Amino acid sequence: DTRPTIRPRNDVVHKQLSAFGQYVAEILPKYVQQVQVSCFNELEIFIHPDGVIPVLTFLRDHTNAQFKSLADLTAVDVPTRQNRFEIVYNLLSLRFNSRIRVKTYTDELTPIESSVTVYKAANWYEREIWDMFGVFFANHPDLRRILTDYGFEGHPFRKDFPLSGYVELRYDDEVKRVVAEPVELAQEFRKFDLNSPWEAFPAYRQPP
């Protein structure tokens, strides 16, 4: 619609992104599984996990796709899927002033090829993904805990990991050191059920 409340939408960028998505799909039919452009003009390419390195290399070196900047590499944990972890690569093409997202899937066991060869920035991002979610990255130069404690056990950002964790720290005089003890909260984190019983967005309705 119109008026200040509604956000203005640019259709030109939408058309450009759709065309380029088709371009990428045609060039890489072996790996590209699905191409989507969001209504807010964000092209997303879904690729089979085996194509992490080829697709990224194409999107980085190709003359008409000069995405030479790995903006952010992250993971989304959806426990309702067999391949719960979804590895998402956010790219930036300075030459064409555009961005693209490469989304792949992985299990808790299936390794994913490291993209350090494609982007050197991928090192620490993949370390974080392994540390927080537990997605092993094959051929990684140094895959180790980057954010958790040295002796920490478990992957915190997993949806099945408790928010407060399983262990807590304190200083004990008898052992003269900081010791790890089972977590005991003086005030339990009060879970608030806020989801309304009435549907909010008809456009995103999943038919039964």
Please give the residues from 143 up to 182 whose contact with other proteins meets the rule CB under 8 A: 143-166, 168-182
Give the length of the chain.
208
How far, in Å, CA of 36 to CA of 45, rounded? 6
Q: Output the smallest distance, CB 171 to other proteins, in A.
A: 5
Dihedral pair phi/psi, residue 59, rounded to 5°: -70, -10
Q: Which is nearer to other proteins, 100 or 114 (CB)?
A: 100
Tell whether residue 207 is a contact of other proteins (CB under 8 A): no
How far apart are alpha carbons 91 and 28 in whole angstroms?
A: 17
Residue written as token pair 């991928």? 122
* Rounded least distance, CB 49 to other proteins, Å: 9
Q: How far is the CB of 62 from other proteins (least distance, A)?
A: 6
110 binds other proteins (CB under 8 A): yes
Q: Are 52 and 73 in contact (CB under 8 A)?
A: no
If one asks whether residue 32 binds other proteins (CB under 8 A), the answer comes out as yes
DSSP state of 166: S
Q: Looking at 70, 85, 102, 114, which residue binds other proteins (CB under 8 A)?
A: 70
Q: Among 56, 65, 87, 102, indicate the residue that binds other proteins (CB under 8 A).
A: 65
The reply to whether 29 sits near other proteins by the rule CB under 8 A is: yes
CA separation (Å) from 46 to 92, 93, 105, 122, 201?
17, 18, 9, 19, 25
Q: Tell me the three state secondary structure of residue 146.
A: coil
Q: How far is the CB of 172 from other proteins (least distance, A)?
A: 5
Q: Smallest distance, Å, CB 53 to other proteins?
A: 9
- The yes or no reply on residue 141 touching other proteins (CB under 8 A) is no
168 φ, ψ to 5°? -135, 160
139 touches other proteins by CB under 8 A: no
Q: Does residue 81 interact with other proteins by CB under 8 A? A: yes
